[PDB]
Amino acid sequence: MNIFRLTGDLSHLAAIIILLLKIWKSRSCAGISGKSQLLFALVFTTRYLDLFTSFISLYNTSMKLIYIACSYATVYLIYMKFKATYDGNHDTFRVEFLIVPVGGLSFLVNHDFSPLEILWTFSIYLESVAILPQLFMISKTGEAETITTHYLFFLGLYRALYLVNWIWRYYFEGFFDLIAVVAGVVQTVLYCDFFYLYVTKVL
């Protein structure tokens, strides 16, 4: 554990809280793709399955439980409460063409053919493309009412801090993860497309 994975996770957490609090106060999830939020909740579900097998630290367990509870609550706030503001007519990305290749990719490319390692690799590959339904929604409508600039800021700071996390990890520990780094580059390119679409079409 280093400071850039630490702050990157906190930056990742800050954005999730911003979106969860924005939907709650505005009583609205218009412009948000619940399919994307469902995928990010599936990411935390398959990434943190090690809670039923391995308790590492109180901080480590709390972050997992907070990540899971926060994105689960966002999904509840989109599909049950405030569902009258869910723009389901535009959140129409056929995500089966996404989880099936990602699932097959995690089945074939992993660090170990172990159940928990396969589902961790799935979460890493799924998290890299989970933003695709939301990008499909924004490009179609050109609108994203619930999306605020500072929500993007902590999304970019999160990916940018994991950029430093990869570098500090290699130079000070000799650790390098081809699977996570490659998927992270895919996630970063798509997240810049998120930021570019917001500036050019929304803001």
Ligand X SMILES: CCCCCCCC/C=C\CCCCCCCC(=O)OC[C@H](O)CO
Interacting residues toward ligand X by CB under 6 A: 2-3, 51-52, 65, 129, 132, 135-136, 139-140, 186
Least separation in angstroms between residue 182's CB and ligand X is 6
Q: Least Å distance between CB 56 and ligand X?
A: 12
Cβ proximity to ligand X: between 18 and 129 the closer is 129
- Nearest to ligand X of 83, 97 (CB atom): 97
| Helix H or strand E segment including 18 | helix 3-26
SS3 assignment, position 146:
coil
Report whether 166 contacts 71 (CB < 8 A).
Answer: no
139-145, Cβ contacts within 8 angstroms, sequence gap of 24 or more? 139/197, 139/201, 140/90, 141/31, 141/87, 141/90, 142/201, 142/202, 143/31, 143/201, 143/202, 144/31, 144/32, 144/198, 144/202, 145/28, 145/30, 145/31
Q: Which is nearer to ligand X, 3 or 100 (CB)?
A: 3
What residue number has its CB nearest to ligand X? 139
Q: Are 146 and 202 in contact (CB under 8 A)?
A: no
Nearest approach in angstroms of CB 7 to ligand X is 10
Judged by beta carbon, residue 83 or residue 176, the one nearer ligand X is 176
Distance of closest approach, residue 94 Cβ to ligand X, in angstroms: 10
Cα four-point dihedral sign 123, 129, 132, 134: positive
Contact 149, 203 (CB under 8 A): yes
Closest distance between ligand X and the C-beta of residue 27, in Å? 25
Cβ nearer to ligand X, comparing 2 with 149: 2
Nearer to ligand X, 51 or 108 (CB): 51
Which candidate, 98, 78, 90, places its Cα nearest to that of 27? Answer: 78
Nearest distance in Å: CB 55, ligand X: 8
